[PDB]
Design an enzyme around this catalytic site. Structure first.
Site, mmCIF file in Angstrom:
data_model
loop_
_atom_site.group_PDB
_atom_site.id
_atom_site.type_symbol
_atom_site.label_atom_id
_atom_site.label_comp_id
_atom_site.label_asym_id
_atom_site.label_seq_id
_atom_site.Cartn_x
_atom_site.Cartn_y
_atom_site.Cartn_z
ATOM 1 C CE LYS B 115 39.838 37.710 39.975
ATOM 2 N NZ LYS B 115 39.149 36.858 38.968
ATOM 3 N NE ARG B 224 50.908 30.111 33.377
ATOM 4 C CZ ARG B 224 50.001 31.080 33.442
ATOM 5 N NH1 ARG B 224 49.623 31.581 34.613
ATOM 6 N NH2 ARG B 224 49.461 31.550 32.323
#
Lengths: 118, 404, 404
Positions: B115, B224
């Site tokens: 993050k 992804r």
């Protein structure tokens, strides 16, 4: 009771369901559920000219007597079904040969209600 | 160059990729735990191989999956989503063993998975990020991205995932009914920028929160494929899974932005085996009867089939139902239909719940944010039509009492 | 105004229409012979009703179908195709009994059903018709048409049905790979003309033959929906069945021509239960396992389902499989895929045969006429992969001989 079945296949609305009974206890496709019941106290058509309902009900009026000459599309009968009265009409043209129904009778769709010769 | 792939996944996405490989004339290899012995991907795939008695561990085991990939003759490997798809180690290993990972390089996976290390890359490339006092009741908008090895990066458009429950996405729509062509252009370009910043390659998704003051704020960057790609495939025509493979086989992107075009709206429902009446408790067990939806506007991506027994170790998703029409009004109607069109006996499903959503006017009106579900608990208090499996029993008892 | 419909048909198209009604929020009513007691449309429909012990007669019986329509509370009636769809009497009867027939008026049905009376109407409206020495080895092109009551008439585009066998259509594609945009514009406009000439209303199809010179000659005008509408629904986005109902409820067409557009190609395979190896002899019996095709580009319109037992009194068509992609090359690939993707145990199907067609280069090259099947008998001499139902027996015998 020796006639009555323990297990059997019920076809209801396109689906079939495998039932085995034993308040009854009852197995629908191998899923057993307690049930409780409270009790409350004609030729099939050979011809295409054999007139039928496609839906059971009670006869309100026969609009024809034996031996009449009838053309396709003539109001031949009336029935009560689904909170209404509605007129069955002749599939085929020709002569009324028999009549297997009177006013008041309850009908089912496998029953032949009059016959007509083409 | 790529002739064989190891689908490193289970369930519904394994089936998708089986379909993708077959399309490209490429041999597919499934992997199943013991629980997934009967899974649809296994039946469908060219080859399959057991990955342990444990339900889960064999799927999350980078090293032996790759042993299998190598032992198998696989040129390349697809991680679908969840599981190992966002785990750099697998790419590193693949690279090492001469296996083309159908994804980005491990560096970017690793970067954008952290993050704070991600937030830096974005702030650096000049991209608004969230505050510590974050965004209140946002619309969740996200942009599909396709990059190739050779520095081409494009976007198919956004998707609206504002319909969600306790941070679980329920209904996804593309494009957003809630955005101007202007917003669409901006958010798409902004996504292509970020992707470029981080030297991305292959399929990815950049997520944003959209503040009631029009501020888009970056949030995640999923490196992804995603569950909800179907919806974007619908409106654009582009097979994304097929591209992923092409990119990884070193090909150039098949389409420039100017050539990327959409029509209509597409909506995708997650047909989970849960019971919304019982606070979405899982409803695992056996699916006794299944009839698949059909005719126009209808696409199904199913885990399940007739007789399938849903194992209890994984997620509840038996199929993704994806509906398409030329416009908002039409879609919703077609949604409602296709939900009824999908016929499933043996297990409680979210269909009924979805019909409540599609009924509700705020939704039809096409203005809503992440709070919509929370802000409308009534949606679970619906008419549960009495099962046809029970009516058949009641009738059969009338026949029993009528005879002995 | 229309709240209930009598689907006067069986099989696959009954299911389509059940889907159409559901979409419109209209109650559907199925009709089944005894043989069709278990048919998918019956399960799917809101109501159903027996129409005789005979397999056929009750379906071709205009008068008691309408008695049922009237008795049932049906406002309107849909004849699908085949059966009574091209029989004027049914319209006349409907009209008489206050039932909106979803089709043209009986006058047109009658006119255009008579080969000579039809050829006249066309020659009058200035439209090239066939010679007594007819067209040699033509491409069979035909144009979808939609008219409303209020004089609006329109075309969605053509479709190519040049792949056919002894006058039975096998594979239908829209638009034609074999025509210029120019030809498309000409043939579409010419179709709209003809339709207008004969004061048509609702859905119809105008068929043409196309010679080696590139001349078009009128041949038939099918005054009904057709099997192969799916393919045109695909490329355009327009629900045709829904429009048919709207037209019949007196609405105006939803789209002017300028608003109608297409993308991509769509191909649709007739998945008949026949065995091509054995001169396409029927292969009636039980379907033991069925997994439906899926993911992008795939639409199924099925009669069959898991366990379904195909009655022998009707046609062999268990489902129509309809594949779509952004272009010719892609489609064919997706075809091949979807055919495999469709998994069907218990009965011999035409799938394997179709895969031969899609393989063959003349076809991929996209130049072919009605003679293609005849002109290539080799297509039936293919590798019949050994059944997984036999491999399981061979293994089980190895276990039997190993254990005692």
């Amino acid at each position: 009771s020796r006639f009555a079945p323990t297990e059997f296949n019920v076809t209801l609305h396109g689906e079939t369901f495998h039932i085995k009974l034993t308040p009854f206890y009852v197995s629908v496709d191998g899923v057993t559920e307690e049930v409780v019941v409270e009790i409350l106290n004609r030729p099939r058509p050979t011809h295409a000219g054999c007139v039928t309902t496609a839906m059971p009900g009670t006869i309100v009026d026969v609009k024809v007597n034996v031996g009449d000459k009838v053309s396709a599309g003539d109001a031949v009968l009336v029935i009560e079904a689904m909170k209404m009265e509605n007129e069955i009409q002749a599939s085929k043209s020709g002569v009324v040969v028999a009549i297997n129904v009177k006013k008041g009778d309850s009908v089912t769709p496998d029953e032949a209600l009059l016959e007509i010769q083409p | 160059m790529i002739k064989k792939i190891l689908i490193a996944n289970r369930g519904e996405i394994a089936v998708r990729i089986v379909r993708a490989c077959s399309e490209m004339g490429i041999k597919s290899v499934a992997i199943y735990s013991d629980a997934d012995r009967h899974a649809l991907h296994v039946k469908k795939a060219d080859e399959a191989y057991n990955i342990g008695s444990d339900p889960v561990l064999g799927y999350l085991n980078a090293h032996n999956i790759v042993n299998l990939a190598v032992a198998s003759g696989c040129d390349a490997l697809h991680p679908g989503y969840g599981f190992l798809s966002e785990n750099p180690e697998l790419a590193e290993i693949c690279a090492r063993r001469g296996i083309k990972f159908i994804g980005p390089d491990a560096k970017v996976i690793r970067q954008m998975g952290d993050k704070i290390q991600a937030r830096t890359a974005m702030i650096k490339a000049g991209i608004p990020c969230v505050g510590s006092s974050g965004v209140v009741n946002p619309r969740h908008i996200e942009v599909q991205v396709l990059a190739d090895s050779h520095g081409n990066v494009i976007h198919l458009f956004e998707r609206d995932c504002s319909i969600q429950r306790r941070n679980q996405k329920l209904i996804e729509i593309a494009p957003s009914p809630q955005l101007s062509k202007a917003q669409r252009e901006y958010i798409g370009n902004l996504a292509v920028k970020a992707a470029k910043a981080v030297g991305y390659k292959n399929a990815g998704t950049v997520e944003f929160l959209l503040d009631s003051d029009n501020n888009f704020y970056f949030m995640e960057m999923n490196t992804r494929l995603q569950v909800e790609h179907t919806v974007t495939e619908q409106i654009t025509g582009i097979d994304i899974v097929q591209e992923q493979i092409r990119v990884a086989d070193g090909q150039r992107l098949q389409y420039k932005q100017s050539e990327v075009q959409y029509r209509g709206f597409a909506m995708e429902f997650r047909i989970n085996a849960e019971d919304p009446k019982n606070d979405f408790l899982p409803s695992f067990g056996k699916i006794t009867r299944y009839y698949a939806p059909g005719g126009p506007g209808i696409r199904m991506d199913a885990a399940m089939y007739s007789g399938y027994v849903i194992p209890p170790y994984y997620d509840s998703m038996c199929a993704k139902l994806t509906v398409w029409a030329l416009n908002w009004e039409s879609v919703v109607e077609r949604g409602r239909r296709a939900l009824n069109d999908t016929v499933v006996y043996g297990v409680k499903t979210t269909i009924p719940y979805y019909q409540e959503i599609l009924k509700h006017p705020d939704f039809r009106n096409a203005i809503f944010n992440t709070s919509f579900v929370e802000s409308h608990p009534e949606l679970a208090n619906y008419a549960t039509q009495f099962p046809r499996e029970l009516v058949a029993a009641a009738i059969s008892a009338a026949i029993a009492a009528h005879e002995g």
